[PDB]
Design a protein around this ligand. Structure first.
Ligand SMILES: *[C@@H]1O[C@H](CO)[C@@H](O)[C@H](O)[C@H]1NC(C)=O
Lengths: 504, 101, 50
């Protein structure tokens, strides 16, 4: 039920006998996977986690100085000298100043003056690199089990039945994971962290308990003291003169000063930069998509063997409508019959009693055996006007529903979305290894690209007329000596035969 | 002010209070009267400015010099900070700018 | 708008009878556009028998 209130929602349907199915997850969207006999699953990607990041370089914005010393020699004495010059922690500058009898010595010429002082970095910022083997994605999996649909369980402490929700950590070390959903069964997932945001031109900047991402060509352009990442208590710095300003000159001395906090300059420069969050030493990124392949072999239903409900069904409120034309129904059941299957039908008139639409939640059932219980289901009403009927006998309830749009419009939109999805799955779509899975792959993707329109167009899914239409089209394409008329017709005929062979 | 000698050279630890007054001490040559005209002198704290100030003949006026003694050249040292708050002046106002992106 | 969706859903519900009526009305026009008008007549009267 985690995929109901999401703007970017897709719909993926696989072949009836097709166990494997590929999907793509975006960091701002969701994926709904449905089948004929399997329960509906909902996949979402929550956060990109970066951990164990190496350090590349560290800058020092605010610094201090101490123990300023100077030494002056006038002409006919050579260059000035100081013992602190050889130390890497003391920075000095040389210069030439005019001297005379007023300064101590006789010859009228300019001398050599040197001035150095200590350098201690009180505050600093750091830069880290990001490697693909460090990334770890987190995907939540929900199951449409006719849950109550109440948003009272935000965290992972409780109110989360372990057979209805699960969390999966996809790592670059082991991309193959086995998910256990309890009574529902087990699934397999193989996700490939590819085609994401490039991490070869990005640096993770940590500064004052805040974090940003910067460009590598810009990180080295900054003019501030720096030093690489070396584990030690005292580090050697380079290019610290950019933070220590020396005065013009003096006949006997030179007084240096240190610049103030450059935090404001960095905050102003990083205005148009991307931001992130961090916990301890780990970082969280909200950008990046993922490609996955699911194997659904041991997944089954939970209430397929249950009986029917002989109690009283009632609506709890007016059924709402989502942006994708889907209708959520919240039912309240009275009676004590235990877990029983919910008899619900969708038709065009109260006397017709003919299924006209499909259900997003397979096998709607009541979860508890209480007297007055509640449940929820999600369905897809047909375009136009429709009637939802719940129950049998003289106690069955009916409700009117309307939905705008056109079937051809939805079919074309779904076809274009499926084509875009198959285009995103450029690599790792087919297998060129052992033979026997190539025909399976071509059938699988032609299904995933054309079934949304096949189900919407070809009548009432009789599965008998469509085979005859395909056969007659194959015959019409066969008895044709002209070029470019037999190949396309035979291809369309085989496509229709296969699409009717799959689930409708 | 404190007067010491470390390695045949005289150091004069002068605090903030002795600012603008002369002081007499003793060297191997004899008595030495040394005047201090430090204008930017501060209180005692780790930030210590130290510079040698030279001997000169009394028949010449000081030019761009704020320390002078007459026995030899004497090394002066004094702290530079404000109100003993353990903080340097750091009043540079360079305002270095960084590229945006 | 109000009637197009209804007749579209009707056509998609039972396409066999609709195609039968269309091919019947196709051969009952004197001109091509006249055949189109004759089949659209059946298309319009299709939802309500009355
Ligand atoms: C330095 O000058 C003072 C000024 O009177 C004098 O008393 C002192 O003897 C001089 N020091 C010498 C000559 O070593």
């Amino acid at each position: 039920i985690r995929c109901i209130g999401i703007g970017n929602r897709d719909f993926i349907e696989g072949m009836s006998g097709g166990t494997w199915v590929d999907i793509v997850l975006e960091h701002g969207g969701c994926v709904t996977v449905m089948s004929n006999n399997k329960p509906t699953l909902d996949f979402e990607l929550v956060t990109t986690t970066a951990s164990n990041m190496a350090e590349v370089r560290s800058y020092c914005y605010e610094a201090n100085i101490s123990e300023m010393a100077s030494d002056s020699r006038c002409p006919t004495q050579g260059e000035a000298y100081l013992d602190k010059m050889a130390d890497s922690q003391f920075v000095c500058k040389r210069g030439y100043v005019d001297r005379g009898w007023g300064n101590g010595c006789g010859l009228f010429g300019k001398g050599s003056i040197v001035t150095c002082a200590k350098f201690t970095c009180v505050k600093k910022l750091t830069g880290k690199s990001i490697q693909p083997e460090n990334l770890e994605y987190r995907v939540l999996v929900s199951v449409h089990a006719s849950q109550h649909g109440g948003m009272i369980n935000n965290d992972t402490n409780h109110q989360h039945d372990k057979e209805n929700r699960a969390r999966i950590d996809i790592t670059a070390s082991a991309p193959r994971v086995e998910v256990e959903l309890g009574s529902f069964g087990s699934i397999s997932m193989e996700c490939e962290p590819r085609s994401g945001l490039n991490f070869g031109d990005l640096y993770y900047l940590t500064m004052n308990n805040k974090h940003w991402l910067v460009n590598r060509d810009w990180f080295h352009d900054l003019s501030l003291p720096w030093h690489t990442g070396a584990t030690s208590n005292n580090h050697h710095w380079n290019n610290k003169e950019a933070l220590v300003e020396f005065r013009e000159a003096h006949a006997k001395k030179q007084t240096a000063v240190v610049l103030g906090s450059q935090e404001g300059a960095v905050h102003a420069a990083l205005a148009g930069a991307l931001e992130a969050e961090s916990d301890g030493h780990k970082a969280t990124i909200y950008s990046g998509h993922l490609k996955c392949r699911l194997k659904l072999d041991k997944l089954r239903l939970k209430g397929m063997s249950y009986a029917l409900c002989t109690g009283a069904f009632t609506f709890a409120r007016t059924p709402s409508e989502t942006i994708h034309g889907t209708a959520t129904v919240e039912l309240q059941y009275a009676g004590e019959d235990g877990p029983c299957k919910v008899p619900i039908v969708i038709t065009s008139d109260t006397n017709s009693m003919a299924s006209t639409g499909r259900l997003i939640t397979a096998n709607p059932v009541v979860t508890e055996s209480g007297a007055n219980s509640k449940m929820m289901v999600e369905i897809d009403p047909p375009f136009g006007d429709s009637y939802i009927i719940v129950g049998t006998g003289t106690t069955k309830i009916t409700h009117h529903w309307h939905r705008a749009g056109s079937s051809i419009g939805r079919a074309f939109e779904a076809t274009m979305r499926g084509a875009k999805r198959m285009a995103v799955l450029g690599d790792t779509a087919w297998d060129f290894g052992s033979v026997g899975g190539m025909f399976n792959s071509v059938g699988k993707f032609v299904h995933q690209v054309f079934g949304s329109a096949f189900k919407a167009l070809f009548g009432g899914m009789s599965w008998f007329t469509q085979l005859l239409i395909g056969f007659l089209l194959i015959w019409m394409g066969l008895n044709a000596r002209g070029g470019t008329v037999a190949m396309s017709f035979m291809g369309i005929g085989a496509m229709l035969i296969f699409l009717a062979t799959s689930v409708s | 002010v404190e007067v010491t000698k470390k390695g045949d050279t005289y150091y004069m630890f002068a605090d903030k209070k002795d600012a603008g007054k002369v002081v007499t001490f003793e060297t191997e040559s004899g008595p030495n009267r040394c005047s201090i005209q430090a204008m930017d002198i501060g209180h005692m704290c780790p930030a210590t400015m130290s510079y040698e100030c030279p001997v000169l003949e009394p028949q010449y006026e000081p030019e761009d010099v704020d320390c002078w003694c007459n026995s030899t050249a004497a090394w002066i040292v004094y702290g530079t900070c404000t109100h003993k708050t353990t903080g340097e002046t750091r009043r540079s106002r360079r305002s270095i700018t960084l590229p945006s992106h």
